[PDB]
């Protein structure tokens, strides 16, 4: 009775970057769906082919959470509609994703005096991309002739560039935190039900 780890995803005091892609396979939860519906005013609560009103009466076997920080201009593309840099290189959803995508403004707590580090984004890795598969490989990308053999530098500056977030009440495309939720149903009993 009343045992759920949902509040371990929200309010983490440190959100993983898009390269980290902090998953959390959550099971055995029979309460605490109020932390999802009632919270700070959500910038986006775009759910998908699982009815958000009907979850309190439907039990799930696996509840997968995913958290990351992205720019407010890139609050889209968290959907089966693969489009954009973050979609084609960083993070992507399947065709029949059955879950909810929650996003909210994080400009109030991720404000930095200097910024331009601690968060990264990908430029070009089109040769490798799979849904629910993080590509944390960051050695080098192919350009010119030689991959600079890991001692890269001038004339082989092809590797990725990190985010330049430094909001000091001086940005409009503020950084937003996102908590993606997904569900699965297999040939196994469902353990994540609603409160009784």
């Amino acid at each position, epitope marked *: 009775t009343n045992l759920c780890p949902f509040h371990e995803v929200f309010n983490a005091t440190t959100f993983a970057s898009v390269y980290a892609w902090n998953r959390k396979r959550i099971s055995n939860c029979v309460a605490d769906y109020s932390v999802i*519906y009632n919270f700070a005013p959500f910038f986006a609560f*775009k759910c*998908y082919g699982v009815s*958000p009103t009907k979850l309190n009466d439907l039990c799930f076997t696996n509840v997968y959470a995913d958290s990351f920080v992205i720019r407010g201009n890139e609050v*889209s593309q968290i959907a089966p509609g693969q489009t954009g840099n973050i979609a084609d290189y960083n993070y992507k959803l399947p065709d029949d994703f059955t879950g909810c995508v929650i996003a909210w403004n994080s400009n109030k707590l991720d404000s930095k005096p200097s910024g331009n580090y601690n968060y990264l984004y990908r430029l070009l890795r089109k040769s490798k991309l799979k849904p629910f598969e993080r590509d944390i490989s960051t050695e080098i990308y192919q350009a010119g002739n030689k991959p600079c053999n890991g001692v890269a530098g001038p004339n082989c500056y092809s590797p990725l560039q990190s985010y330049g977030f430094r909001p000091t009440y001086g940005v409009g495309h503020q950084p937003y935190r996102v908590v993606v939720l997904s569900f699965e149903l297999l040939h196994a009993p469902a353990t994540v039900c609603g409160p009784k």
Partner: antibody
Amino acid sequence: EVQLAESGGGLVQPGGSLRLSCAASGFTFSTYDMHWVRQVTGNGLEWVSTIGTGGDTYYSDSVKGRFTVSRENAKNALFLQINGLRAGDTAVYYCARGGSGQFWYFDLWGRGTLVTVSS
Amino acid sequence: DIQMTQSPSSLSASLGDRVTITCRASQTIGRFLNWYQQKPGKAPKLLIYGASSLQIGVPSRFSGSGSGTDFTLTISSLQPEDFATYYCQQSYSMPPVTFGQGTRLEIKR
């Protein structure tokens, strides 16, 4: 018969508040979800908002921020509260009931309360 | 954000004509598409839910079916009570449930 009513129709000043209601008949109002879908005069349908059985509220992109749906299981009446209307909101807010299933579908539409926003 | 671009509304036909109302979306919505029939003298009403399931009180000629991204609210034979506007709706995205622009069924002469 099983029909959805409506109220709150009438002329209103731009920016003034307004409340619409949606009475129930026959069916159980407390075990079915309710939705609001407005239709601009001569245009097509446009989804506005909805509140589920568990009291959870949902709104649209051009609706969230100033509208506030309200459900009271007593009197079997759905409610919708509006704040700060404008000219682009002149539409008939058809009340709708959500049927049982895994996806949202509207199986009972009300008569439709008309809202004309102008000074 | 998910678009629901429908076929051109200018689709005239007489009685009995096999009208085929086609409506597509921006991506796969599964079987969550559903139609709505609105005569411009009364309230809206649904025709097909789940894109394949006939509504109670709707005859068998309303054979609206489809799969994945393509749907056709086909009426093999019309009736004087069928001339109205028809709207498609997707339920894949639950909170932003979007509609189409519509299609008007008019009597041909």
